[PDB]
From a paper:
ZIKV is a mosquito-transmitted flavivirus first isolated in 1947 from the Zika forest of Uganda1 that has recently emerged and spread to over 30 countries in the Americas affecting millions of people. Each E and M protein pair form a dimer, with the E–M dimers lying parallel to each other to form a herringbone-like raft comprised of a total of six E and six M, with 30 such rafts covering the virus surface. Flavivirus E protein is involved in receptor binding, attachment, and virus fusion during cell entry. The ectodomain of E protein contains three domains: DI, DII, and DIII, followed by an α-helical stem region that lies on the viral membrane with three stem helices (EH1, E-H2, and E-H3)10,12 and a C-terminal transmembrane region containing two transmembrane helices (E-T1 and E-T2).
ZIKV (MR-766, Uganda strain) was grown in Vero-E6 cells, purified, and vitrified for the data collection on the Pennsylvania State University Titan Krios. Density corresponding to two asymmetric units was designated as a subvolume, which specifically consisted of dimers of three M and E-protein pairs straddling the twofold symmetry axis. The final map reached 3.4 Å after postprocessing. Our structure improved in resolution to 3.4 Å, and we discovered two distinct lipid moieties coordinated by M and E helices that have not previously been described. Surprisingly, an unfilled density was observed arising from the inner leaflet and stretching down between the M and E helices positioned such that there was one unfilled density per each E–M protein heterodimer. The Y-shaped density that arose from the outer leaflet extended inward ~10 Å before branching into 5 and 8 Å arms, all of which were bound between two E helices stretching between S405-L424. Due to the absence of the lipid in virus propagated in mosquito cells, we compared the pocket structures between our map and that of PDB ID 5IZ710. We found that the pockets are nearly identical with the exception of the side-chain density corresponding to Trp 474, which swings into the lipid-filled pocket, but away from the empty pocket. Alanine substitutions of M residues T57A and S58A did not affect virus production, while alanine substitution of E-protein residues (F449A, F453A, H446A, W474A, and F497A) were lethal for ZIKV. Only mammalian cell-cultured ZIKV incorporated the crooked lipid into the hydrophobic pocket arising from the inner leaflet.
Numbering used by the authors:
A (entry chain E), B (entry chain C): 1 to 501
C (entry chain F), D (entry chain D): 1 to 75
The structure:
Amino acid sequence: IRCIGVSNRDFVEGMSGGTWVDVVLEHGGCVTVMAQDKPTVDIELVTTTVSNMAEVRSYCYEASISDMASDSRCPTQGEAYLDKQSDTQYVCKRTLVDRGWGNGCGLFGKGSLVTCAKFACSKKMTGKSIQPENLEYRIMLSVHGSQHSGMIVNDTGYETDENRAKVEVTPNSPRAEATLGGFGSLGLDCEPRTGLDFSDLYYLTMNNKHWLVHKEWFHDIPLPWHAGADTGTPHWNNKEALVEFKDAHAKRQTVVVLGSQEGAVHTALAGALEAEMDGAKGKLFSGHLKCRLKMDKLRLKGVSYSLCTAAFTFTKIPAETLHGTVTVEVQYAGTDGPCKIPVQMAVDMQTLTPVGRLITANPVITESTENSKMMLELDPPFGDSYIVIGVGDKKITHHWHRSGSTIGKAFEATVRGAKRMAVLGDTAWDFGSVGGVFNSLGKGIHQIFGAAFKSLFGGMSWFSQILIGTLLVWLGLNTKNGSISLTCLALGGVMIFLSTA
Amino acid sequence: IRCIGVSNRDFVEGMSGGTWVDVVLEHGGCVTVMAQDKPTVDIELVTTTVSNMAEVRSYCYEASISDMASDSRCPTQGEAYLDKQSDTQYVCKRTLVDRGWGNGCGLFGKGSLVTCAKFACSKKMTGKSIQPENLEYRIMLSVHGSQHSGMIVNDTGYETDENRAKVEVTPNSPRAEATLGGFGSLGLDCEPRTGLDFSDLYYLTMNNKHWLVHKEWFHDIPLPWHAGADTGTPHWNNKEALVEFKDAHAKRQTVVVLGSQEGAVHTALAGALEAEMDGAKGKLFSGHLKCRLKMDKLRLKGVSYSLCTAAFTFTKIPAETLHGTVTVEVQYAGTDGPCKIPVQMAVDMQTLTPVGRLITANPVITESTENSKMMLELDPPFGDSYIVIGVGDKKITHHWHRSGSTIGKAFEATVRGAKRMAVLGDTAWDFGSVGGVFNSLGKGIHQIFGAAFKSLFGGMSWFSQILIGTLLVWLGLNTKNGSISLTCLALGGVMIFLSTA
Amino acid sequence: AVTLPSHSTRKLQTRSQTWLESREYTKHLIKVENWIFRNPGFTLVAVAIAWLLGSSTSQKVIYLVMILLIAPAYS
Amino acid sequence: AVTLPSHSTRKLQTRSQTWLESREYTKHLIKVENWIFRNPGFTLVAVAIAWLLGSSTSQKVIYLVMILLIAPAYS
């Protein structure tokens, strides 16, 4: 439920004796945390809301010049001067023009010419700063249990459902607990400060389109900027980055403004996360949290129930959810009340030996009317097998064939882990970890390599990474020495880092 | 007159026995053609008018998307389809989104999603082609003679002046003759087809600012273009160069348009000649003509006049016109009528030996009133000297000191010629030429080198020319072989070609 | 102005799409191919400079590649 | 629209200056110095590769220059 159709779901199984497990919730990726004896809960980070942002600059990407004037002095008579030259709204430029007896002067030579022109800006983009005491991650939870198909993305009603509960995690209140009625309460000891590193991100805003630009990039744009939250007539430092003074040859100097740089900066971002805004708060939809799941009071509701009698019936013939797991929906015809579904999977039906585990732990029927639907999820074995749902002779069966192999499983999981390590980087060592001398020492070594790599290369794009990766792999296949593994690991860390995007 | 204050004047002296001389009139540069016994005439190319241009493309640099729709199919159910997908006004894109039991489907997997969006363009730039039977160069002439200061740039009245006459030279009528009353008529055997090579130039037009873009550049812009002179609703081939389809992760695909590329193309020209337009004709103000001056009926008016008696007086104390030449304005107090001014320059006034030539040939007073002003132009010798204007004892004198040296003269002229050769290129061998086995064979060798250099490098900017020039000069100072003068002449032809701009 | 700095250097690496992702692979290749197709004469100049600067037959190839990349972008 | 081809290759040579000629000498130097200033460690990783490639002493310097020119343009 809530995570059964997602194409980027990860299963985190196993804890430290039932205490807790670390997870890294990403935007767009779901996490299914199945424990030993506890209900399977689905955790998903939905939004990241940045609030109370204060602006720093405002670049002017489309200007216009009003009345322009000029003044000229004869040669060897000083240099020109306009009254509107001491005005900080006029962009001016002085140059030397040829001056002679025909131009009304009295001496041949290079004169002097000053051209003023009023700078008035029409459109501008504001960049607001993000402080990490403003992030507020929202986490939606969902337990596998008394829920049918109409419970997966159906968000209409959670706090009256016993199965769905949202949790808002702020760096002011990092640990929050979700109340799942009957199942207990899952505890989340989040890390809402070490998220997407909002100490070097801004919030661009250009014509009702907001981005998440880097601070260094935002401080290097060559456009006329002013100091802050000015809504009146700003000062516009660096006006000369949009006007262009052209002298033809003679006593003439034309001033023309460059057009609207909106498109020129749209194609200049090309790496920035697109965000949105719902008023004063900026709602991001990309990033990641780092969460620890205290699962000690998540209890299994319905372990003392009685089995079902009979009359199960398949509705919505089972399906395969991109990972092998099977989503079965049943319909118990009976009035037993809160009973327990006797589901299992079996090779040849004589012995009924169980062969596959069950993703939804302890399925249970709670609705006591005669037609009570319920949705399971199994994890079949590789090869053909049967899905037995019931006891006695009125049990229903369904032939299932899970195409694949354990070697394919292992390679798929390795590719998954490599992508997670290329995306998250250092925090990828805290995804299923329970603590140790490997998932805590390897993280240190990976952190050292990550700092020494993001500070060394740290500034190349996809194409340049491919280029220097080929160069380094060729320096590895030649120049036989001890510094060859060094120029081949720096081929891997540059091809898989990009070339898995 | 008309060319005395210009900072880029060139003196062309000497012909083939009085027959003709070749000149290359540029925009912004004047030519003073002094002959042996003929009046000094000043030729200047003022405008180049291209008419009757027919457009080829129209790129759309600012678009907008109206109503957008979408459609989705369940997995293994085909792919999506919109009714507005067969419409050639809608830009669409198909992608696969995750689909499951929560999204209303019945099977887990990658679905199919098509997003249409109506493309409506608001602004566009038109590129018109230039045919060399449309150029019409206008050439303004002016003879040194009965003209005072109020005759230099004063264009109010030429065809009633005997001294100023405009000539319009079309490739339909290349040779035209200017009527200068009393002086005869100067003949111009122009070359209006081998001008600025208008077979590879277009006429951009973007928001009332016109340029002269190269054809190759104009055919490579990545923007939605249509076929021609469509004023209604065009077809807009290649719409997908301004829209951007973004899928978040789920069954969602947003379409956003990039902003106005006006500034992005303004900073992308950066090498194009800015032109103007006065209606349907495009008036350029940069280029060059190639003219031959048939001077056989340019006669010297006033060679049979009688000398002046006395009473000359300096008005507008002489000046130096950036080249050494001296512009003297006198005021003959007398009623002699059409007399002749006895001007000369002399070292120590005992012998009155003439030392400098006279730029204005045979100065003459024509006005017969008592206060008739007239403007000369001399070319003093290096050092101090006197300007004697008159005969007898009522002659006026003026001390003049021309600072310089003949070596400075020669180096200045060499720099002038080098700049002309870097700008005009091949045609720089036809600037004062009268024919020969040097000014006609050297032009062939220079033409060969020019073709083999504009086809070899031909595509580098100022910075890259500097770069490869340093690289080649360093390959010259090393790698001792016969191919070292080859990599040093290709250092000169790349530093002086640019690094004299 | 004319020196707008690209953000692809500092692109934010997340699970989601960046601003212009589909247009980021075939961009520099498009520019290089366009410039080379427009100015074919410079290929032999790059060849003649690489095949004269390099000593081994695999430093000449690297020099040719780096020149044919420096040219279409002008540093 | 992300690959607007620069027209400074086909520069029309005349007496008058072209469209943006004042803003043309310091256009690439600024783009290179901003990148070298924002990413200094690449100076070291470029010196390393130049020294590992160039057999001569005036060959590794050329490799270093060409790497520091190719990097801040990514093409």
